[PDB]
Symmetry: C2
Subunit: 285 residues, 2 copies
Amino acid sequence: VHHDGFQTVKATIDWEHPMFKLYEKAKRNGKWNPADIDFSQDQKDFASLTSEEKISALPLVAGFSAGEEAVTLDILPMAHALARQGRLEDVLFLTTFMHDEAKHVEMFSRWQQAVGIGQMDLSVFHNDHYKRIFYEALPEAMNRLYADDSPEAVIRAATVYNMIVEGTLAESGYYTFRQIYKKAGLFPGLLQGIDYLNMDEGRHIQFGIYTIQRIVNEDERYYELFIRYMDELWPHVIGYVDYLTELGKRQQQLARTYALEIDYDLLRHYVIKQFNLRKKQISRT
Amino acid sequence: VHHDGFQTVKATIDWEHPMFKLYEKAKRNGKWNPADIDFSQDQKDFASLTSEEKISALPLVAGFSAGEEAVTLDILPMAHALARQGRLEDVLFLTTFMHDEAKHVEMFSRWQQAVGIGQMDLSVFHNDHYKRIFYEALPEAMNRLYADDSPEAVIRAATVYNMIVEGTLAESGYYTFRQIYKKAGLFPGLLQGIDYLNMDEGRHIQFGIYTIQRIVNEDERYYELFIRYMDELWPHVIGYVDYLTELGKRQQQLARTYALEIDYDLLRHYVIKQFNLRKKQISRT
Ligand SMILES: CCCCCCCCCCCCCCCC(=O)O
Ligand SMILES: CCCCCCCCCCCCCCCC(=O)O
Ligand SMILES: [Fe+3]
Ligand SMILES: [Fe+3]
Ligand SMILES: [Fe+3]
Ligand SMILES: [Fe+3]
């Protein structure tokens, strides 16, 4: 359907809009290119590993590669719905958001190629709980926005994507990668990439927070909805976390070999800490 | 609806795909930031002008500011349709495409602000023919892709957006800006921006060409459709061009003052040259 006018013809960009400022920061801090990362040492490290240690690292890479690919496809409806509501600055920022995820898909896929597992199907490490979040609830909530851009729909989409998938799982994954391999001295290329992903991620979660907080602000009954959507998802969050944990407890040889005392109980409570801390970033008032 | 799998989990990115290569080029050559452009001299130039010369430049800025804003909102359905067809590399590239246009909206709006016309409504320089292309046919063709991603729909969308709006009007506009103001010594900031826009634009038109050529390749009856959609639009193309030309012939004082012999007849045949040359870039075979 038709445009009825153009903001930057009638007026200008709202330069003071937070999403315009968050767009500006993204351009300044989003210059990194996965294609400049040197994975040659990563390749050597992965070959150096035994078959059992090789396994140790794949689940996490599995969950991330599929995750980045899901959010790259699935952020589009949000940009569409906000564009329809005339939120130009939100859209400007969202272009950086979508390119960020394209680079993230790119980064993990380069790593797989480089270390020689690109031809290996890693879908096997996606369990039921993971499929429920990523194969199902995420795309349902996002695509919903094509036909229903109510406050409710928008809140639930930001919650699933920005607060749960990014704000809870992705954050915990970044932490898990560092806890394990930055210590081991392994996969310097991957960790370079993970640090850049983690930076990008800050902007993604701030968008989620702003989006949710401005809808809560108009009517604090929506706060309750927010908490409810968080808690609806927790079981699959932890159910994936437990699954990865038990895969870990059954394949200790990467831990044995690299003198790591992998405190799965500390990863567990980091996830929890993440979940509760995302809740705290939304004010009821 | 659900994801049924993920390419970068089952396999990797197709690294040899042209849209993956075009994505790579975009990252290398898309670093420019409108916010680094110095418009201080532009501000002085615009104030230096008489009221009549001030007018001379606004139509063109009008058509561009609305144009950039239209394509920023209106490229989204293309990314959506290709994402649904599983064309991952196309999507990766399209993230650069969408960010490019966000920067283009940003560039012209900064210029208006800087020279002091941000508060002026420039919609008055959009005539009937322009509204038909930009207010109507462009969004119709793009949004169509949400419910109809047939070869026909896709060809017609690439034709309206990439071959006509970018490939014919935008290209001619870049040329018109240089012909007039690069000579006059005016608006160095704006022209800096225009040069960057022109570079970005090369990738946008190549995407259009690749998209159209791969559908023609499967069935050369679609070539005819391509030419037809080009010719359907020509009247509004030229009808805008004539309108801008007559606005120009009635406000000569920028020409008189800056020793410009503005060959509107040469701009005219540059537009035509553009139109015919876009046709030539699609092979029937
Ligand atoms: C053993 C402790 C478990 C740690 C939790 C790991 C969760 C893996 C992360 C996979 C999902 C990543 C989603 C990406 C989101 C984005 O890129 O914006
Ligand atoms: C006097 C000679 C006329 C020259 C033709 C000028 C046409 C003005 C351009 C306005 C449309 C620009 C559309 C932008 C497309 C994009 O940014 O991808
Ligand atoms: Fe990501
Ligand atoms: Fe993210
Ligand atoms: Fe543009
Ligand atoms: Fe363009």
